[PDB]
C-alpha cells in the first residue's frame, strides 16, 4: 500500500497500475495497491478526485471513501468526499457509475451527480454539468447554488488561507458562478458583488463580513 497525499494550493496527477489516471484535488488522500492483486481494483480516498478508469469489464474498480463505495467498470468520473465539508458529491463525465451507500444503491450516467449531506443524511440525484464540476482540473471554480460555508472550503483548499466567517453575521448564501484562474481577491470579490459579503485580511486569516 503506498499513499499519497496533496496539500493546500496543490495538485496531484498519478497513473494507477491499471492505467487509471487519477487527479487529487488540494487536500486529498488516495491509498492505493502498488499492485491490483484481488479481484476488484480498490482505492482509498478522502478529498476531492478525477478517476478516468480503465475498462476492465472483469475487474470492478472500487473508489472507497467513508459514505459511499463508487463502482465502476470504466468510466470518468469527480468524487468529492473531503472531511471537513458538509457535503459529498460524485459527478460522472463519462461512463456509468454505480454509488453504493448502506441503504441506498444508485447508478448515475454522465452529467448526472449524486450529492450527500454529511450533517444530515439527505440524498439528492440530479443532473449538473461535470465538465464544470471537474473544473478545478484546469484551475476553475464552479459554484451553483452552492452553500457559501462550502465555497469558503474550496477557496481555504484552492489559495492556501484560511478563511473564516463573522461568527455574529448570518451566512445563508448560496453561491453562482465560474472563474477561471482567477485571483482569491477576484474571487472575493465577485462574491461581494453578488451577496454584499465583504473580507478584510488580518494575520494570515482573511475574515468575511457584513455589514448594513
Ligand atoms: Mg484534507
Keep these: 500500500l503506498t499513499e499519497i497525499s496533496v496539500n493546500h494550493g496543490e495538485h496531484k496527477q498519478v497513473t494507477l497500475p491499471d492505467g487509471t489516471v487519477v487527479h487529487l484535488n488540494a487536500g486529498t488522500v ?33 473508489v472507497r471513501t467513508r459514505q459511499a463505495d463508487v463502482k465502476v467498470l470504466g468510466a470518468s468520473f469527480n468524487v468529492k468526499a473531503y472531511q471537513e465539508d458538509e457535503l459529498m458529491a460524485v459527478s460522472v463525465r463519462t461512463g456509468k457509475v454505480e454509488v453504493d451507500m448502506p441503504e441506498s444503491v444508485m447508478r448515475l450516467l454522465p452529467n ?6 454529511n450533517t444530515n443524511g439527505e440524498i439528492l440525484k440530479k443532473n449538473e454539468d461535470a465538465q464544470k464540476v471537474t473544473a ?12 457559501i460555508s462550502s ?16 461568527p455574529n453575521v448570518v451566512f445563508d448564501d448560496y453561491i453562482y458562478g465560474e472563474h477561471d484562474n482567477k485571483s482569491l481577491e477576484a474571487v472575493l470579490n465577485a462574491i461581494q458583488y453578488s451577496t454584499g459579503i465583504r473580507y478584510r485580511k488580518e494575520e494570515s486569516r482573511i475574515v468575511l463580513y457584513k455589514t448594513s
Design 30 to 62: 488516495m491509498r492505493y495497491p502498488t499492485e491490483f492483486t484481488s479481484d476488484i481494483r480498490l482505492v482509498e480516498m478522502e478529498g476531492e478526485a478525477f478517476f478516468n478508469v480503465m475498462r476492465d469489464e472483469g475487474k470492478p474498480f472500487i
Design 112 to 117: 448526472e451527480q449524486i450529492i450527500v449531506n
Design 136 to 147: 478545478w482540473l484546469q484551475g476553475g471554480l464552479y459554484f451553483n447554488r452552492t452553500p
Design 151 to 166: 465555497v469558503i472550503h474550496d477557496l481555504e483548499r484552492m489559495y492556501n488561507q484560511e478563511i473564516v466567517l463573522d
